[PDB]
């Protein structure tokens, strides 16, 4: 089983670069490519994310896609840029300009042949493929458009293969764009039926975590990318290492997706400690369980207090014991039965991996299918309706083959997803 990574746009490419840095440190791979791992348990499943060259070097199984050479040049100039494959590097001269029409219809189509060639080549290089993992931002042009087109082609080429999608959904109070509601509305409807699960990243929640949970004076986009990459590694720690109670991405999808449209998930990591408060708190399974369900720990900005958890998944890493990795879940179920849905008993799945992430002897990643995720879809709904009632910023899209009908179709799908979540949130037996 292998997860081949695809990363699109500036946000997606930088997130993928930080992810590959984290994975290389976990598996002992240096920036150059050698293996300095203390134990070869790291190497025994290194094929999941790394392809071995005949010289013993390890190359990430990654596809760097963008419409601007600048992001590719920066990521290859980074400390771990030398690790990636130049053939895997793919870029276009003319950027999307935060336009889904450029990202999907005009400039995406010309370069999608090359990205499909590279992705397929890596696919048959895989002896057995678990699936694809695409990281991107829905607020941009190249991240949203070409990312959605890649997802649409990849799902239909490999129907039974997992399609992880890590989409950074933009927010009003951190937004640095005026057409990001258009891009998100035009992209996430494709994510609805083209990806088997799309956990959502929010920059405002990441900044809130860095401000309070991490107490970081000067975190950056790289710090937010590392926040995402921690969970991106914890989600497949079970694939990459043996564990007491192992799982895989299909197991997580089966346990977290009750209905096909309900695959947009929560986002959390634990423990998240500041430099000063590291020694002042006792890290253990109990505090991990309490911090994973903490709303302020959540790296998606939609507090669960207004929603209900369809399902939850806790991927713990480190030497542990099962009764307490599970009775904490049972206790939180009992004490938050109001916040957990009644008609689906035992909402929480627990997975155990014996190898903790670098820097800890104990960690956990939380992925929840809470019904509060409808909040950001709602907000982008009002933003989209506000800009679409006057047809503002629509000529940019519609001069390039796009027209009015699919904008209304995207709003239609937004209402469909919102009602799909709301009806199951308030449904009774």
């Amino acid at each position: 089983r292998e997860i081949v990574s695809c990363q699109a746009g500036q946000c997606g490419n930088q997130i993928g670069s930080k992810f590959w840095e984290v994975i290389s440190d976990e598996h002992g791979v240096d920036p150059t490519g050698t293996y300095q791992g203390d134990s070869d348990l790291q190497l025994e499943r290194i094929n999941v994310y790394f392809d071995e060259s005949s010289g013993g070097r390890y190359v990430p199984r990654a596809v760097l896609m963008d419409l601007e050479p600048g992001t590719m040049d920066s990521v290859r100039a980074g400390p771990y840029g030398q690790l990636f494959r130049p053939d895997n590097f793919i870029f276009g001269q003319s950027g999307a300009g935060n336009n889904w029409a450029k990202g999907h219809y005009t400039e995406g189509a010309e370069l999608i042949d090359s990205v499909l060639d590279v992705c397929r080549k890596e696919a048959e290089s895989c002896d057995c493929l678990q699936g694809f993992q695409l990281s991107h931002s829905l607020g941009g042009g190249t991240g949203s458009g070409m990312g959605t087109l890649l997802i649409s082609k990849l799902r239909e080429e490999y129907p039974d293969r997992i399609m992880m999608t890590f989409s950074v959904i933009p927010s009003p109070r951190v937004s640095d764009t005026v057409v990001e509601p258009y891009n998100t509305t035009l992209s996430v409807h494709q994510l609805v039926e083209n990806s088997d699960e799309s956990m959502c990243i929010d920059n405002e929640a990441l900044y809130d975590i860095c401000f309070r949970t991490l107490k970081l004076t000067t975190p950056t986009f790289g710090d937010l990318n590392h926040l995402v990459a921690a969970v991106m590694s914890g989600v497949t720690c079970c694939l990459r290492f043996p564990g007491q109670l192992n799982s895989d991405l299909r197991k997580l999808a089966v346990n977290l997706v009750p209905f096909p449209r309900l695959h947009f998930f929560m986002m959390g990591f634990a423990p998240l400690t500041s430099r000063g408060s590291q020694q002042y708190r006792g890290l253990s399974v109990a505090e991990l369980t309490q911090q994973m369900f903490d709303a302020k720990n959540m790296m998606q900005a939609a507090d669960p207090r207004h929603g209900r958890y369809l399902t939850a998944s806790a991927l713990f890493r480190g030497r542990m014991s099962t009764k307490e990795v599970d009775e904490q879940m049972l206790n939180v179920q009992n004490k938050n039965s109001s916040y957990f849905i009644e008609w689906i008993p035992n909402n929480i799945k627990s997975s155990i991996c014996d190898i903790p992430p670098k820097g800890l002897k104990m960690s956990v990643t939380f992925i929840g299918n809470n019904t509060c995720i409808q909040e950001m879809f709602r907000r982008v709904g009002e933003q989209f309706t506000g800009m679409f009632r006057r047809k503002a910023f629509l000529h940019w899209y519609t001069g390039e083959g796009m027209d009015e009908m699919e904008f209304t179709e995207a709003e239609s799908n937004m209402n469909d997803l919102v009602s799909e979540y709301q009806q199951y949130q308030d449904a009774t037996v």
Partner: peptide, 15 residues
């Protein structure tokens, strides 16, 4: 080593 020079300059800016 232009990449290395870029890394060093980014480190100085970060500092």
């Amino acid at each position: 080593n232009t990449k290395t020079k870029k890394q060093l300059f980014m480190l100085q800016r970060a500092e």
